[PDB]
Design a protein around this nucleic acid. Structure first.
Ligand SMILES: [Mg+2]
Ligand SMILES: [Mg+2]
Ligand SMILES: [Mg+2]
Ligand SMILES: [Mg+2]
Ligand SMILES: [Mg+2]
Ligand SMILES: [Mg+2]
Ligand SMILES: [Mg+2]
Ligand SMILES: [Mg+2]
Ligand SMILES: [Mg+2]
Ligand SMILES: [Mg+2]
Ligand SMILES: [Mg+2]
Ligand SMILES: [Mg+2]
Ligand SMILES: [Mg+2]
Ligand SMILES: [Mg+2]
Ligand SMILES: [Mg+2]
Ligand SMILES: [Mg+2]
Ligand SMILES: [Mg+2]
Ligand SMILES: [Mg+2]
Ligand SMILES: [Mg+2]
Ligand SMILES: [Mg+2]
Ligand SMILES: [Mg+2]
Ligand SMILES: [Mg+2]
Ligand SMILES: [Mg+2]
Ligand SMILES: [Mg+2]
Ligand SMILES: [Mg+2]
Ligand SMILES: [Mg+2]
Ligand SMILES: [Mg+2]
Ligand SMILES: [Mg+2]
Ligand SMILES: [Mg+2]
Ligand SMILES: [Mg+2]
Ligand SMILES: [Mg+2]
Ligand SMILES: [Mg+2]
Ligand SMILES: [Mg+2]
Ligand SMILES: [Mg+2]
Ligand SMILES: [Mg+2]
Ligand SMILES: [Mg+2]
Ligand SMILES: [Mg+2]
Ligand SMILES: [Mg+2]
Ligand SMILES: [Mg+2]
Ligand SMILES: [Mg+2]
Ligand SMILES: [Mg+2]
Ligand SMILES: [Mg+2]
Ligand SMILES: [Mg+2]
Ligand SMILES: [Mg+2]
Ligand SMILES: [Mg+2]
Ligand SMILES: [Mg+2]
Ligand SMILES: [Mg+2]
Ligand SMILES: [Mg+2]
Ligand SMILES: [Mg+2]
Ligand SMILES: [Mg+2]
Ligand SMILES: [Mg+2]
Ligand SMILES: [Mg+2]
Ligand SMILES: [Mg+2]
Ligand SMILES: [Mg+2]
Ligand SMILES: [Mg+2]
Ligand SMILES: [Mg+2]
Ligand SMILES: [Mg+2]
Lengths: 180, 88, 228, 131
RNA sequence: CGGCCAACUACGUGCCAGCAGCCGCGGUAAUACGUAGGGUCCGAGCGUUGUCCGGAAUUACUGGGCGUAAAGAGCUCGUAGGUGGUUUGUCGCGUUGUUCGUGAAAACUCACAGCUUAACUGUGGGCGUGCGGGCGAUACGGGCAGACUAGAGUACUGCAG
RNA sequence: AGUAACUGACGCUGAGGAGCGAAAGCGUGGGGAGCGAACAGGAUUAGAUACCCUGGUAGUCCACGCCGUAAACGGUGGGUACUAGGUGUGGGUUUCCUUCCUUGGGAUCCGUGCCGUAGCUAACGCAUUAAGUACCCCGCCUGGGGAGUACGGCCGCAAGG
């Protein structure tokens, strides 16, 4: 089960000595809803071929989201492409607050609570690149502590330890219910 | 430009000791001798702008050194300015 | 552990490098010193890296991995072809088709075509076609047989890729990192170290050292093949 | 001119991290020394030791690298600088990297880390964000 | 009820009569004009109009740039101001170190309670993000009370232009 | 550049202010070969008040004053610290194959060309002489015309700035 979405459809054109040659380009985002993200950019002369190319490229290119239970770990300032997209977690149930392309990519990621803002070049392609880079910039507390050579309690806050323990207990309960 | 004879004469004659050379007293002495000599030259040579640049640079340098002397000690500043007979 | 000895390596001149006009400063921590404008490779880290490569290759061959041999320089073509045809392992020695490992579904059709052409030629039908297209098909036999040696025998896609002289063979290692396949290659004084996962210090420009390194890795592969 | 030793130190350290260097030599000072001390205590750096030079004391800092070569330092930036000096009260201690980073705060005890500073309830000027 | 923007077909005139917040729509066969139906939104209110903030990171302290899109003054000397190369010493005027001491009422936020619930208000908290004095600290961030030199300058010899 | 004898926080940038400044232009008094705005003719074109040809007055030269603008460009302010190289040039100290002749080899600092990593940038591109990563201060920009213009103020004899 994968989540599919389309963000923008553009009628690109090419010129020859005879006249105008039209073409179609599409960008799609694929995700499993658990924290696995794939982006695809596909070009054709017709929408079905375009979306097929986009889906294939997205299937080729994947990326994993290290989310804590339901939300993001820490605020991230994703500076890439030409747009500035700033992501940070929030209180559970607040919702994934983001623009169009960011909305699509985060919903395909499966996150449920995020605060986002795009600060320039509202173009969908650049926004998607900036969000992907923002997720790449994300760091996870366990291997952050491993890199720093200091144990978890001496690195990460007790509140996020409590949240992680609650998330682990909920995941264990869900696994038990699914097995039974 | 000053040469060895008069320059060593000046550094010794306004020196605190017979060995020190970089003292502010000797520095100001060299700057003053240079400026009077070459100002006498520029009283004849009028349109030497590249040398008037040297005038202004050495004078600002002098002003910084005199400010340092006044800051570090009022008595030495007054003695220096009185022995050279200038205004400031 | 190692098989080749220090005096043998020195005699083969595996420690040499290029001139001072070609070395990239990414080899500073591998280069020991310079004499007569020629850079030398560092022996002890060379041994550590070849030992790690030996461990990796024995592991992958024991677990059943496919390793493609890559080398196109005029000096090493014969050596790589000979050792690969004796060990029975797929190799590429003359022409590297762009993205043949990445774009495998396209070259699979032409492997099918070449096998079909071999089957039809072995039947003996030559006078049933005009001599013009007979000559054309013989020429395309020559071309494709000359440029395609390893995909005849690999089929089932590789598990590791081994390359010589990566600065000229950047296409193969680039495809290898793009597909995620582990890379083992010889890095000279002018090569990027992050390109190869398991670098093996040495010379691609000296036939003695090239032949010895290829024989050592072929012996490792043979040992793994007996060890399955 | 040479006008900010702490910013110069932070920039040289993060430039060395970007350039994958291992050892950096800087002029020694108490601020540099105890900042290196708190860096060692938190574990972002490997180790430091002082030396003697042609003129005065100098401190060398060895960067930290792991088996997989990824940087042990993500980025540095200074918030309190000559001119714009920013300070924090006892309740508005800055949160860096969602609490996963470290802010260096000079309190009545000294240059101490933000978490234990909030534990003590003490506060002051934030030196830099290290994450 | 063209796309932005959840809501389409027919009938009547065709660069006319007309729409409109941006793109923009009629030159005989308009989902953009007028009429019909049909659907959408809202509702005892429905739209238009005007003022103010947000998106506008579009005045960028947090949080912008100056090669070509807007920008380095023609370039120096240099006054007032702003900022300082090490470590050798007090007072604590930049400052945090805790406590008692103000923060009118009202409003905001949390919980309680009453008008049948509704506005409305009924009680007690809490809130009331600033500023006053007495008591307890000295790591950075200044003046002040003494020494050294990694910036700078001088001093000795040469140097090319 | 070398020795580093001495000064021992004197350093930096710098709003207003002040000094220098391509060519052309102006006053006075000289000079004036060549060149050459303006202006005459000859030539082309339907048309030339231009491109072309023949002449030549300011100016171009000198001294004293003036105006103070250039695509005044590296279209990038200065200063400091750090960050991989290769190839030429200039200046100076050293040392060693040593003939001790030799761009011989090596070390060092300053200046100036070219290509290139990581990095930055929307791209071209920059890349230790950064547009790289920062610190200090200063000027400049907030859609295109209107308009670098009117009025007002300051400078200049005026053109004008
Ligand atoms: Mg940025
Ligand atoms: Mg924007
Ligand atoms: Mg926008
Ligand atoms: Mg001279
Ligand atoms: Mg509609
Ligand atoms: Mg709609
Ligand atoms: Mg009609
Ligand atoms: Mg209706
Ligand atoms: Mg508004
Ligand atoms: Mg700031
Ligand atoms: Mg801004
Ligand atoms: Mg511009
Ligand atoms: Mg300019
Ligand atoms: Mg100007
Ligand atoms: Mg002062
Ligand atoms: Mg007090
Ligand atoms: Mg009190
Ligand atoms: Mg109080
Ligand atoms: Mg009250
Ligand atoms: Mg509110
Ligand atoms: Mg009640
Ligand atoms: Mg209340
Ligand atoms: Mg408020
Ligand atoms: Mg001060
Ligand atoms: Mg002494
Ligand atoms: Mg000195
Ligand atoms: Mg000379
Ligand atoms: Mg001494
Ligand atoms: Mg200076
Ligand atoms: Mg200044
Ligand atoms: Mg100044
Ligand atoms: Mg000013
Ligand atoms: Mg000014
Ligand atoms: Mg003047
Ligand atoms: Mg004047
Ligand atoms: Mg002229
Ligand atoms: Mg002139
Ligand atoms: Mg005139
Ligand atoms: Mg005149
Ligand atoms: Mg005259
Ligand atoms: Mg003439
Ligand atoms: Mg003429
Ligand atoms: Mg006449
Ligand atoms: Mg004429
Ligand atoms: Mg100008
Ligand atoms: Mg010029
Ligand atoms: Mg400038
Ligand atoms: Mg600078
Ligand atoms: Mg240099
Ligand atoms: Mg790169
Ligand atoms: Mg880029
Ligand atoms: Mg470069
Ligand atoms: Mg630079
Ligand atoms: Mg810039
Ligand atoms: Mg006009
Ligand atoms: Mg204008
Ligand atoms: Mg006026």
């Amino acid at each position: 089960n994968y989540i599919e979405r389309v963000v923008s459809i553009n009628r690109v054109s090419k010129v020859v000595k005879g006249g105008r040659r039209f073409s179609f380009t599409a960008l799609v985002i694929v995700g499993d809803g658990k924290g696995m993200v794939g982006v695809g950019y596909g070009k054709a002369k017709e929408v079905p071929a375009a979306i097929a190319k986009g889906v294939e490229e997205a299937r080729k290119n994947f990326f994993r989201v290290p989310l804590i239970g339901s939300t993001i770990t820490h605020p991230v300032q994703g500076e890439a492409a030409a747009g500035v997209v700033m992501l940070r977690p929030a209180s559970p149930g607040t919702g994934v607050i983001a623009g169009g392309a960011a909305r699509a990519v985060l919903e395909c990621a499966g996150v449920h609570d995020i605060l986002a803002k795009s600060l320039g070049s509202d173009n969908a392609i650049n926004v998607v690149h900036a969000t992907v880079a923002a997720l790449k910039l994300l760091q996870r507390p366990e291997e952050v502590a491993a890199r720093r050579g200091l144990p978890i309690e001496d690195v990460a806050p007790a509140g996020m330890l409590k949240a992680r323990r609650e998330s682990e207990a909920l995941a264990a309960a869900a696994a038990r219910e699914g097995s039974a | 430009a000053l040469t060895a004879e008069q320059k060593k004469e000046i550094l010794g004659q306004y020196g605190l000791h017979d060995t020190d050379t970089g003292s502010p007293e000797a520095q100001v002495a060299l700057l003053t001798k240079r400026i009077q000599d070459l100002t006498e030259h520029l009283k004849v040579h009028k349109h030497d702008h590249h040398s008037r640049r040297g005038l202004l640079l050495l004078v600002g340098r002098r002003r910084r050194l005199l400010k340092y002397v006044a800051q570090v000690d009022v008595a030495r500043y007054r003695s220096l300015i009185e022995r050279l007979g200038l205004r400031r | 552990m190692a098989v080749v000895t220090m005096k043998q390596l020195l005699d083969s001149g595996a420690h040499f490098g290029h001139q001072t006009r070609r070395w990239n400063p990414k080899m500073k921590r591998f280069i020991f010193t310079d004499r007569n404008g020629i850079y030398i490779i560092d022996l002890q880290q060379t041994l550590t890296y070849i030992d790690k490569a030996y461990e990796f290759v024995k592991e992958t061959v024991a677990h059943g991995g496919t390793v493609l041999f890559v080398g196109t320089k005029k000096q090493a073509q014969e050596s790589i072809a000979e050792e690969a045809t004796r060990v029975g392992m797929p190799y590429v020695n003359q022409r590297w088709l762009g993205g043949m490992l990445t774009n495998f579904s396209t070259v699979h059709k032409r492997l099918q075509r070449l096998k079909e052409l071999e089957a039809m030629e072995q039947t003996g039908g030559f006078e049933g076609r005009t001599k013009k297209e007979i000559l054309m098909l013989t020429r395309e036999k020559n071309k494709l047989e000359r440029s395609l040696g390893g995909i005849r025998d690999m089929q089932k896609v590789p598990s590791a890729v081994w390359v010589v002289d990566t600065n000229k063979e950047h296409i193969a290692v680039g495809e290898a990192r793009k597909l995620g396949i582990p890379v083992i290659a010889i890095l000279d004084t002018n090569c990027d170290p992050d390109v190869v996962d398991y670098p093996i210090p040495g010379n691609d420009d000296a036939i003695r050292s090239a032949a010895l390194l290829t024989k050592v890795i072929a012996s490792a592969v043979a040992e793994g093949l007996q060890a399955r | 001119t040479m006008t900010d030793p702490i910013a110069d130190f932070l920039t040289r350290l993060r430039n060395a991290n970007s350039a994958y260097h291992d050892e950096v030599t800087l002029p020694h000072s108490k601020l540099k020394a105890n900042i290196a001390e708190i860096l060692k205590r938190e574990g972002y750096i490997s180790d430091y030791r002082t030396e003697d030079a042609r003129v005065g004391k100098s401190l060398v800092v060895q960067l930290k690298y792991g088996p997989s070569r990824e940087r042990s330092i993500a980025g540095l930036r200074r918030v309190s600088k000559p001119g714009l000096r920013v300070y924090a009260k006892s309740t508005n201690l800055p949160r860096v990297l969602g609490g996963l980073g470290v802010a260096i705060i000079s309190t009545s005890s000294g240059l101490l880390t933000d978490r234990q500073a909030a534990r003590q309830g003490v506060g002051g000027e934030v030196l830099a964000y290290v994450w």
